[PDB]
Amino acid sequence: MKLLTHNLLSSHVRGVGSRGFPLRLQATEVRICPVEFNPNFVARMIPKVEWSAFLEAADNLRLIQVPKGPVEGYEENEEFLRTMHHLLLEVEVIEGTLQCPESGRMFPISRGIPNMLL
Amino acid sequence: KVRLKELESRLQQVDGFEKPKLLLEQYPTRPHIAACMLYTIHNTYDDIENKVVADLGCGCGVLSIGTAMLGAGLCVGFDIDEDALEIFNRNAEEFELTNIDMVQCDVCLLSNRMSKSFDTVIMNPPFGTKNNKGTDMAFLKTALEMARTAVYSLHKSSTREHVQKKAAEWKIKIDIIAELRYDLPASYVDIEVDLIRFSFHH
Ligand SMILES: C[S@@+](CC[C@H](N)C(=O)[O-])C[C@H]1O[C@@H](n2cnc3c(N)ncnc32)[C@H](O)[C@@H]1O
Secondary structure, eight states: OOHHHHHHHHOOOOSSSOOOOOOEEEEEEEEEOOOOOOHHHHHHHGGGOOHHHHHHHHHHTTOOSOOOSOOTTGGGOHHHHHHHHIIIIIEEEEEEEEEOTTTOOEEEEETTEEBOOO | OOOHHHHHHHHTTSOOOSSOOGGGTOOOOOHHHHHHHHHHHHHTTOOSTTOEEEEETOTTOHHHHHHHHTTOSEEEEEESOHHHHHHHHHHHHHTTOOSEEEEEOOGGGOOGGGTTOEEEEEEOOOOOEETTEEHHHHHHHHHHHHEEEEEEEEEEGGGHHHHHHHHHHTTOEEEEEEEEEEEOOTTOOEEEEEEEEEEOOO
């Protein structure tokens, strides 16, 4: 499970209703997988990231120096896009759990696959 | 540019189900169907490259493997069966495709976290009745909620009038883009399906 996937699975569309909450990640095994850098793709993902969920998951994975939000002119900032490419697409959770905030139940991640089935 | 025959030839090398589960309607999308469907999504509608794509009922991964090869930013496959996803994962590794993820879940029971989470949703859904509805119509409602821009799906041509009626009730745009056929596993002969593009009013 990549962190972009965690973000998709976790995030809510913010609107007039009350705040939704992400799945809390607790990882026990991670791997690094090189993904071909697609800067146009990373740039269009930036405004769609739910940052608070991304930072929480990145903290659990012991990632460091993580950007705390979009930088100025980030569409032209290759270093920012490269960093976010790595953090969103190249750090894969292989074993772990996702905690449901409404239930407290733990859903297992095994062989990189979250099992959300009850 | 990946030509149509090359795409299909690659998809012929996607391994299928070792032990298909009949009750889940497990069979791989036929390579001719998958290649024509994905080639059209990409070359006519530009709905794959640099996009984030969901494959509902991804199975052994034929449609997701092809989507990843056509330049998706990320293709995420969803399936209820852990055995199918194990095969999908092996296929992704053999093809050296790293722009893929997968999730085990019941597509009919996803939370509203999935709302408008993908650019494009693609699927070859099951057809069996569930709670007085065709399972493909339950998949379709879920797909439309997940997709920001377009849904591409295969539905029985004999059900076309119903799909058109639901699209009208949901105020969704619908276009039948091809009439296709493929054979089911011998244990099940021909099935006539429409390839349908669903999209949204602006
Ligand atoms: C016709 S197969 C799809 C073919 C797939 N594109 C492939 O190449 O393998 C239908 C898939 O739907 C899955 N499925 C059935 N019911 C489901 C459900 N409620 N939620 C998620 N997947 C389901 C099956 O496990 C199966 O893999």
